[PDB]
Amino acid sequence: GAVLSFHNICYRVEKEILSNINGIMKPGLNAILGPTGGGKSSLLDVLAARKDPSGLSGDVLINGAPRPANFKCNSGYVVQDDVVMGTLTVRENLQFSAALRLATTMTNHEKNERINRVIQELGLDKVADSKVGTQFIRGVSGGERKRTSIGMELITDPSILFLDEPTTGLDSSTANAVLLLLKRMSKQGRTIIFSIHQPRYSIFKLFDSLTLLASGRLMFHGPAQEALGYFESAGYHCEAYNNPADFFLDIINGDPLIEKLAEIYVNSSFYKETKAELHQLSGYTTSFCHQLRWVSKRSFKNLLGNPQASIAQIIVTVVLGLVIGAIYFGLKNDSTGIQNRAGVLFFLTTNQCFSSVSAVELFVVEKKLFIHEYISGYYRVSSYFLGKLLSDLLPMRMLPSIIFTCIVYFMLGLKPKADAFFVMMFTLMMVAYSASSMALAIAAGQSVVSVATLLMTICFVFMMIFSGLLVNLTTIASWLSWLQYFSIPRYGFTALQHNEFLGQNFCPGLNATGNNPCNYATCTGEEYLVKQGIDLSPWGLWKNHVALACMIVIFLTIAYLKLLFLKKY
């Protein structure tokens, strides 16, 4: 089997969370234990290479050789809080893990067989076709979600398996079942390493090695059955009916003292034996397209499975379209035509911009999962980015524009030509994409959403002021005019105006015989446009669209760089 032998570890983050730690984790159900403040999860990550190598200051050595570069890929790790996708079926999650982790050369049949074997081992065949739990509804119980995570890691038939708090939040019976399962797995020769919180003695009866850590020091390392003898030799005695694990924790808590216990251990025989043994010992798979395909499939399944956001979006869009069609129904080429036309176009543009502050949740929600799967070697960050965009951002931002136009354009009696119709659709879509892209660039690489939302709203108000309606941009001062070139709504609104007002007459019965509209009348659309600053040449419309495209590219690239320079360790 595998023999993971740490030695003289010291990790500096210059607070030193772990001071001096040596041991050997032979095959079996090895364990790590101690108070919450003690560096147990930290040590676990150190052994699994999930922590920045800079602070590390010791020699980790497996089976007599230094850790291979591909270690994380050939050794599983199970996070504390399950990251499985509730909106998917158990077998679907295992299938995703199998498809990306296992080699491409293998056939789909072999991978399906392996998945069946794993489900059989973990006893999940009952729920192999059930939802894993949206947490709005729970297709499976907590224990089965945990077993599913363990299965995802087990797909590649790992030799070394790390776990963090495998029994936390579970009921006593569920925890016992999980740990008995781990004991069965270890009997096969698989080295299991894990951390726990105040285990029961039925659980503690099953261990093969113990590692007790407090304030970053090694109180004990050796066979669990003999830990009680060691402490009793130290003088501390355990009354019956008291769980020995709690007894160790009491001894640590003093119910300073901790350094005294460390000194005792260094004087111990176990330490000498372990040190002698240590000195004796010292003596991507897949292509880009495949990753993109699979992550996009998973994202779309989640998108469908969670109907709240999508369905609410479509319904609100339709209702707004119908209401606006009723209110602005039958626009007239009279004194009030200009007001209503500009108003509706402004409203549509702002609705597209302000309805995209819900894109912050795209990457904020799935930060932990992305980090875990990137470290574990599932996929690159490029494939995650493009697949997630192509599955979530593209369709649900393209739809509202189509709904709005199809509903309003004919109820409102806007221009009857088709070239104008599709320009309206394209312009609204580009506004939505650019706004959502900006939201991504602002929200990417963040775990808190509120700050991002506030920032987006503030930015959008300051953009809205510089839209043509409220301010008459020709009037703004020169030292402030240049900010108008940073506004998405300005480009969209200007394009829509240039599409609609051109070739419209708003002075009925002028008769042009006196030929005097007083020069204060705004009797034509061209005149209104030039008075608002717009350009009547065909270049104006297309330059607005061009600017929107450039903003899209800029913001998406920023988001990618923010993900690629995120702290993943």
Ligand X SMILES: Nc1ncnc2c1ncn2[C@@H]1O[C@H](COP(=O)(O)OP(=O)(O)OP(=O)(O)O)[C@@H](O)[C@H]1O
Ligand Y SMILES: COc1cc2c(cc1OC)CN(CCc1ccc(NC(=O)c3cc(OC)c(OC)cc3NC(=O)c3cnc4ccccc4c3)cc1)CC2
Ligand Z SMILES: CC(C)CCC[C@@H](C)[C@H]1CC[C@H]2[C@@H]3CC=C4C[C@@H](O)CC[C@]4(C)[C@H]3CC[C@]12C
Of 161, 245, 547, 556, which lies in the binding site for ligand Z, with binding defined by CB under 6 A?
547
- Centre a 10 Å sphere on the Cβ of residue 319 and count the other Cβ atoms it contains: 11
Q: Counting contacts by CB under 6 A, is residue 243 touching ligand Y?
A: no
CB of 487 to ligand Z, least distance (A): 9
Q: Counting contacts by CB under 6 A, is residue 486 touching ligand Z?
A: yes
Rounded-to-integer distance, Cα 539 and Cα 392, Å: 32
CB of 368 to ligand Y, least distance (A): 23
Say if CB 277 and CB 232 are below 8 A apart.
Answer: no
Widest CA span in the chain: 117
Residue 540 is assigned to a ligand binding site:
no
Choose the binding region for ligand Z from 241-249, 263-271, 384-392, 542-550 (rule: CB under 6 A).
542-550
Select the binding partner of residue 485 from a copy of itself, ligand Z, ligand X, none (C-beta < 5 to 8 A, by kind): ligand Z
Rounded-to-integer distance, Cα 49 and Cα 67, Å: 9
Choose the binding region for ligand X from 38-46, 342-350, 472-480, 498-506 (rule: CB under 6 A).
38-46
Q: Counting contacts by CB under 8 A, is residue 225 touching a copy of itself?
A: no
Buried b (16+ CB within 10 A) or exposed e, 428-458: bbbbbbbbbbbbbbbbbbeeeeeebbeebee
CB of 136 to a copy of itself, least distance (A): 13
Residue number, 184 or 417, with CB nearest to a copy of itself: 184
Tokens of 514: 């006196």
Select the binding partner of residue 354 from ligand Y, ligand X, ligand Z, none (C-beta < 5 to 8 A, by kind): ligand Y
Tokens of 150: 């363990």
Tokens of 184: 């069965």
Residue 197 is assigned to a ligand binding site:
yes
Q: Counting contacts by CB under 6 A, is residue 39 touching ligand X?
A: yes
Q: Counting contacts by CB under 6 A, is residue 554 touching ligand Z?
A: yes
Q: Pattern 345-364, binding to ligand Y, x per CB under 6 A? A: --x--xx--xx-xx------
Q: Counting contacts by CB under 6 A, is residue 13 touching ligand X?
A: yes
Say if CB 94 and CB 155 are below 8 A apart.
Answer: yes
Q: Counting contacts by CB under 6 A, is residue 436 touching ligand Y?
A: no
Residue 9 dihedral angles phi and psi, to the nearest 5°: -75, 145
In 65-216, beta strands by DSSP E: 65-66, 75-78, 160-164, 191-195, 210-214
Residues of this chain, 313-332, that bind ligand Y according to CB under 6 A:
313, 316
CA dihedral 265, 268, 270, 273 (to 10 degrees): 120
Say if CB 179 and CB 195 are below 8 A apart.
Answer: no
CB of 465 to ligand Z, least distance (A): 17
CB of 544 to ligand Z, least distance (A): 7
Tell me which residues touch ligand X (CB under 6 A). 13, 17, 36-42, 80, 164-165, 195
Tell me which residues touch ligand Y (CB under 6 A). 312-313, 316, 347, 350-351, 354-355, 357-358, 454, 457, 461
